Design a protein around this nucleic acid. Structure first.
Ligand SMILES: [Mg+2]
Ligand SMILES: [Mg+2]
Ligand SMILES: [Mg+2]
Ligand SMILES: [Mg+2]
Ligand SMILES: [Mg+2]
Ligand SMILES: [Mg+2]
Ligand SMILES: [Mg+2]
Ligand SMILES: [Mg+2]
Ligand SMILES: [Mg+2]
Ligand SMILES: [Mg+2]
Ligand SMILES: [Mg+2]
Ligand SMILES: [Mg+2]
Ligand SMILES: [Mg+2]
Ligand SMILES: [Mg+2]
Ligand SMILES: [Mg+2]
Ligand SMILES: [Mg+2]
Ligand SMILES: [Mg+2]
Ligand SMILES: [Mg+2]
Ligand SMILES: [Mg+2]
Ligand SMILES: [Mg+2]
Ligand SMILES: [Mg+2]
Ligand SMILES: [Mg+2]
Ligand SMILES: [Mg+2]
Ligand SMILES: [Mg+2]
Ligand SMILES: [Mg+2]
Ligand SMILES: [Mg+2]
Ligand SMILES: [Mg+2]
Ligand SMILES: [Mg+2]
Ligand SMILES: [Mg+2]
Ligand SMILES: [Mg+2]
Ligand SMILES: [Mg+2]
Ligand SMILES: [Mg+2]
Ligand SMILES: [Mg+2]
Ligand SMILES: [Mg+2]
Ligand SMILES: [Mg+2]
Ligand SMILES: [Mg+2]
Ligand SMILES: [Mg+2]
Ligand SMILES: [Mg+2]
Ligand SMILES: [Mg+2]
Ligand SMILES: [Mg+2]
Ligand SMILES: [Mg+2]
Ligand SMILES: [Mg+2]
Ligand SMILES: [Mg+2]
Ligand SMILES: [Mg+2]
Ligand SMILES: [Mg+2]
Ligand SMILES: [Mg+2]
Ligand SMILES: [Mg+2]
Ligand SMILES: [Mg+2]
Ligand SMILES: [Mg+2]
Ligand SMILES: [Mg+2]
Ligand SMILES: [Mg+2]
Ligand SMILES: [Mg+2]
Ligand SMILES: [Mg+2]
Ligand SMILES: [Mg+2]
Ligand SMILES: [Mg+2]
Ligand SMILES: [Mg+2]
Ligand SMILES: [Mg+2]
Ligand SMILES: [Mg+2]
Ligand SMILES: [Mg+2]
Ligand SMILES: [Mg+2]
Ligand SMILES: [Mg+2]
Ligand SMILES: [Mg+2]
Ligand SMILES: [Mg+2]
Ligand SMILES: [Mg+2]
Ligand SMILES: [Mg+2]
Ligand SMILES: [Mg+2]
Ligand SMILES: [Mg+2]
Ligand SMILES: [Mg+2]
Ligand SMILES: [Mg+2]
Ligand SMILES: [Mg+2]
Ligand SMILES: [Mg+2]
Ligand SMILES: [Mg+2]
Ligand SMILES: [Mg+2]
Ligand SMILES: [Mg+2]
Ligand SMILES: [Mg+2]
Ligand SMILES: [Mg+2]
Ligand SMILES: [Mg+2]
Ligand SMILES: [Mg+2]
Ligand SMILES: [Mg+2]
Ligand SMILES: [Mg+2]
Ligand SMILES: [Mg+2]
Ligand SMILES: [Mg+2]
Ligand SMILES: [Mg+2]
Ligand SMILES: [Mg+2]
Ligand SMILES: [Mg+2]
Ligand SMILES: [Mg+2]
Ligand SMILES: [Mg+2]
Ligand SMILES: [Mg+2]
Ligand SMILES: [Mg+2]
Ligand SMILES: [Mg+2]
Ligand SMILES: [Mg+2]
Ligand SMILES: [Mg+2]
Ligand SMILES: [Mg+2]
Ligand SMILES: [Mg+2]
Ligand SMILES: [Mg+2]
Ligand SMILES: [Mg+2]
Ligand SMILES: [Mg+2]
Ligand SMILES: [Mg+2]
Ligand SMILES: [Mg+2]
Ligand SMILES: [Mg+2]
Ligand SMILES: [Mg+2]
Ligand SMILES: [Mg+2]
Ligand SMILES: [Mg+2]
Ligand SMILES: [Mg+2]
Lengths: 50, 92, 100, 88
RNA sequence: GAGCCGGUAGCGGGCGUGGAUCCCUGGAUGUCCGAAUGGGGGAACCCGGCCGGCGGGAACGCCGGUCACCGCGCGCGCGGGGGGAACCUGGGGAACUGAAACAUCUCAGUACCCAGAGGAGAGGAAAGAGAAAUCGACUCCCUGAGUAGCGGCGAGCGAAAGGGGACCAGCCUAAACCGUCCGGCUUGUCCGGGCGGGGUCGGGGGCCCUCGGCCGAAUCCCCAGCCUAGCCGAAGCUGUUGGGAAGCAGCGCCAGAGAGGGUGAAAGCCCCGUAGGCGAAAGGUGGGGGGAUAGGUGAGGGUACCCGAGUACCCCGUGGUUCGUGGAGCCAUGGGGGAAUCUGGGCGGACCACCGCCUAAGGCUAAGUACUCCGGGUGACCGAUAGCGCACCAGUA
RNA sequence: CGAAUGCCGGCAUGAGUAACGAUAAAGAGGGUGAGAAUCCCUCUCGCCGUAAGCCCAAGGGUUCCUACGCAAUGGUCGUCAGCGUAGGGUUAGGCGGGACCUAAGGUGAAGCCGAAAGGCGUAGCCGAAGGGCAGCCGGUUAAUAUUCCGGCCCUUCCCGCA
RNA sequence: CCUCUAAGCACAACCUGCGGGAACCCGUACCGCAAACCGACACAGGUGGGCGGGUGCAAGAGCACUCAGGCGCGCGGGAGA
């Protein structure tokens, strides 16, 4: 769990973004919603040791 | 994999009427798509959901090819009488 | 890949057409259509908009791509094709000889 | 048919004839159809415990040679695999 | 190495000379179906069991493992299963056709089906070939040669030797005997069963006392080189008609680059390139180059020990080879009879006797050759009814 | 290239000719619209009424509904449409299937037989508008409603108490 | 579903009520004797089950009319060979 509880947080954030997108209120789309390239797989990469 | 279930709500004239009784129909992840997403909506909006229904919608389209987007499952919560919260009342 | 070419966003002579010999500024490379825009072809776009905003006053309408095999770069020289000098760690574009 | 210690069956022609035959007079052939000569097969029963083979019956002495043995192992219930793979 | 966020054109939204976009290499995630493989299934879906996880919870849930079947050895483990445009081997295998009918025949062991296998497959080290006191594995190409032949001696089918080439290579195993060991018994100074050691025409081997003795893998790690991204790559300016110059003209220059493309047309000198030469951290690749390993070193003379068994040989039935019953050998083998292990056994085209040749009934064995889904270049190849069926969102409507 | 009842493409002729797909049948007044016999409404007229009306399976799949349209498809026209564009719309412990069962028939461990493909085949499993299983009535939007909601009832399981 | 005992368990396990809990996947729109299915067509054809009202004629799922409901059959206007 050295990298978890962070993607739970960032997937919570992306289900603030996808809420904000459906109503007409998401005015930085690719500036925010394509976080999941570097962010979000920011800490979805470790070698599963042991 | 709990916030990758409830994909999006729907702004619609029918799911603005869900705020009088039973909270709004979301498009849910149409596979891994159980009606026990009650522990995917109350773990997301901190409520106590009584009853959930289920669907399968959204067919075809022209412009050269078919299947307008997806065929996403979408339904709701019949969440307990006034834990209905979580700023949703915007737009309707 | 193949799509890389003469130069980048600097000042550059064009030796093309009506503008056979014109030193334009920073050039704003296209380049999948292999052009730039730089300062030369200034043909009028007889268009309103796609979004109907701030309507038609005059037309001082913008430029055109200008195919990039005719934008001769510049240095303290005129023309003189670019070259590569590496200096053991870099890759710089030095012209037929002046410098830079 | 089968094989159990030998090669499978073959395919023959027939080659009818209607003639006198060379050492008498002029010869001939008639019709070359496919007889399908299924090899000689006999279900043999041996007493390893209850074991059964489809052996070629020009190879019944060979399967009794295979039975005149003691290959160090007891019963799993069926066991012709150790009788047929400890064949030469 | 400066632009990007695919085929973007539009929301404007961001992101980059502290290095992005891309391309390559190596991982990670790979939902579901599919050999499908937990069971079912009407493919892309349902329904589980066990373990481990979230009143998120004991019940329904979802996650992440594991649950097919078969083959090989000691419940335990390593493979197999399906796919592939052709190419190949084996098992099967037509018929129209041709014979100016047709049945033998031909088409043809073709097409096709099935199995198998791999970048090749096959075959392969002589029980060979056949006239030479000869050749010496196998394959492929050209000759032999449309010869020899076969043939309702019609139609037609059609070698092989020799000889040129390519390529090159030989080897493991009971060509018996010694010990080992679960048990066999009539406890036998012994039956067969697994290994192990022996064993491959100082004609072979095992056994019995002289005369003592290391070449080299197909296997293994290496290393170039090859790819899988790329990179550097020479030298032209002016005037002219013109929409536009590279055209025309003048004055040049490079050339290990005057192949080609695009540039507003006709460009060696604008670009991309080409000649030439660099480039691999990572993976494949590879004795082409050197390295070691595994293996190989009754020469002699004897006491007749062993040289692959329902096999050879004989007959009946057939296929293969040029061979269609013929004088029918040979090679395979479905039926029946059924041997011996070197004064053995087979072959040299019935057979027999001389003279030769060669060792079957166990297996492996690179290389050269066929192929082209694939990538590249090449064209007295096509230029949209052509070329693939598709230059285009086509195996689509 | 001139012929192959050639092939592909084009355009003719036939020809403004036959037809326009039921001899159930229309007429009028307002609208709307640029435009109307055809669209909407009204009022008569007619036609089916064991259907030419409702409901469910089969099948088809978004044709449903609303709004913007009318080039194209409607055998005419079309503002209309089922056609084009975009957006909505299909809510189940109780209805139907599956977490249940079998019939014919498949598949099929075992077993048999086939040159290979494979062909059989016991148990088992699959197999359904058959058996079994817990729901009725009303309302609501533009569309769903035995699903949403209102009332009453009922079923399985799991935990706790007796 | 009812029942009987094997294995087993008899500190379980079932059974009856009362309290709480849990109830999953798919189908659901619309046409459905048709302009949306099958017939290349908005095709006079084909299509399974259920309700299919009233009055009259002996009865009737007939026939005649007609509720409810749904259509006037997606070309018409003339003329009167
Ligand atoms: Mg449902
Ligand atoms: Mg549509
Ligand atoms: Mg660098
Ligand atoms: Mg003859
Ligand atoms: Mg024949
Ligand atoms: Mg017997
Ligand atoms: Mg994009
Ligand atoms: Mg980088
Ligand atoms: Mg990057
Ligand atoms: Mg990329
Ligand atoms: Mg994961
Ligand atoms: Mg499966
Ligand atoms: Mg199955
Ligand atoms: Mg399914
Ligand atoms: Mg917890
Ligand atoms: Mg827990
Ligand atoms: Mg599992
Ligand atoms: Mg191994
Ligand atoms: Mg296979
Ligand atoms: Mg024939
Ligand atoms: Mg003939
Ligand atoms: Mg004939
Ligand atoms: Mg032949
Ligand atoms: Mg090979
Ligand atoms: Mg071989
Ligand atoms: Mg030899
Ligand atoms: Mg030859
Ligand atoms: Mg030769
Ligand atoms: Mg030779
Ligand atoms: Mg050699
Ligand atoms: Mg022994
Ligand atoms: Mg040995
Ligand atoms: Mg001696
Ligand atoms: Mg090395
Ligand atoms: Mg090197
Ligand atoms: Mg490269
Ligand atoms: Mg360069
Ligand atoms: Mg250059
Ligand atoms: Mg001119
Ligand atoms: Mg040119
Ligand atoms: Mg031109
Ligand atoms: Mg040129
Ligand atoms: Mg070079
Ligand atoms: Mg390397
Ligand atoms: Mg390395
Ligand atoms: Mg290799
Ligand atoms: Mg021998
Ligand atoms: Mg015998
Ligand atoms: Mg012989
Ligand atoms: Mg003769
Ligand atoms: Mg002798
Ligand atoms: Mg012999
Ligand atoms: Mg010989
Ligand atoms: Mg002989
Ligand atoms: Mg002779
Ligand atoms: Mg080989
Ligand atoms: Mg070769
Ligand atoms: Mg190419
Ligand atoms: Mg041409
Ligand atoms: Mg050309
Ligand atoms: Mg064309
Ligand atoms: Mg074509
Ligand atoms: Mg053309
Ligand atoms: Mg296409
Ligand atoms: Mg013509
Ligand atoms: Mg003619
Ligand atoms: Mg002619
Ligand atoms: Mg024509
Ligand atoms: Mg015409
Ligand atoms: Mg006429
Ligand atoms: Mg007429
Ligand atoms: Mg008419
Ligand atoms: Mg009437
Ligand atoms: Mg009537
Ligand atoms: Mg509608
Ligand atoms: Mg029109
Ligand atoms: Mg029309
Ligand atoms: Mg209008
Ligand atoms: Mg529509
Ligand atoms: Mg209920
Ligand atoms: Mg039910
Ligand atoms: Mg389930
Ligand atoms: Mg079932
Ligand atoms: Mg049965
Ligand atoms: Mg069967
Ligand atoms: Mg089963
Ligand atoms: Mg049923
Ligand atoms: Mg039923
Ligand atoms: Mg409805
Ligand atoms: Mg409904
Ligand atoms: Mg009741
Ligand atoms: Mg519950
Ligand atoms: Mg309904
Ligand atoms: Mg009906
Ligand atoms: Mg209708
Ligand atoms: Mg139809
Ligand atoms: Mg028809
Ligand atoms: Mg009609
Ligand atoms: Mg009809
Ligand atoms: Mg009927
Ligand atoms: Mg009557
Ligand atoms: Mg009637
Ligand atoms: Mg009509
Ligand atoms: Mg009349």
């Amino acid at each position: 769990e050295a990298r978890k509880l962070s993607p739970v947080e960032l997937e919570k954030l992306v289900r603030e973004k996808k809420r904000e997108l459906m109503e007409l209120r998401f005015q930085a789309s690719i500036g925010q919603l394509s976080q999941n390239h570097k962010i979000r797989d920011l800490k979805r990469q470790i070698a599963r040791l042991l | 994999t709990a916030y990758d279930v409830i994909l999006a709500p729907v702004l619609s004239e029918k799911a603005y009427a869900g705020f009088a009784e039973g909270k709004y129909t979301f498009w849910v992840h149409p596979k891994a798509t159980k009606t026990e997403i009650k522990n995917a909506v109350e773990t997301a909006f901190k409520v106590k959901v009584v009853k959930v229904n289920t669907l399968h919608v959204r067919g075809k389209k022209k412009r050269l090819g078919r299947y307008l987007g997806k065929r996403p499952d979408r339904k709701k919560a019949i969440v307990q009488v006034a834990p209905g919260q979580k700023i949703e009342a915007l737009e309707g | 890949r193949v799509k890389m070419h003469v130069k980048k966003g600097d000042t550059v002579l064009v030796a093309s057409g009506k503008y056979k010999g014109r030193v334009g500024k920073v050039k704003e490379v296209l380049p999948k259509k292999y052009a730039v825009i730089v300062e030369g072809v200034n043909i009028v776009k007889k268009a309103v908009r796609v979004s109907p905003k701030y309507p038609q006053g005059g037309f001082i309408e913008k430029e055109a791509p200008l195919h990039a095999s005719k934008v001769r770069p510049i240095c303290p020289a005129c023309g003189k094709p670019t070259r590569v000098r590496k200096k053991f760690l870099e890759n710089g574009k030095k012209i037929r000889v002046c410098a830079k | 048919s089968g094989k159990r210690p030998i090669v499978a069956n073959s395919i023959q022609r027939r080659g009818k004839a209607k003639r006198e035959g060379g050492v008498g007079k002029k010869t001939t052939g008639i019709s070359k159809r496919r007889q399908y000569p299924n090899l000689q097969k006999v279900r043999v029963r041996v007493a390893g415990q209850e074991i059964t083979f489809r052996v070629a019956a020009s190879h019944i002495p060979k399967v009794y040679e295979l039975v005149e043995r003691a290959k160090g192992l007891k019963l799993e219930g069926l066991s012709p695999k150790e009788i047929k793979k400890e064949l030469l």
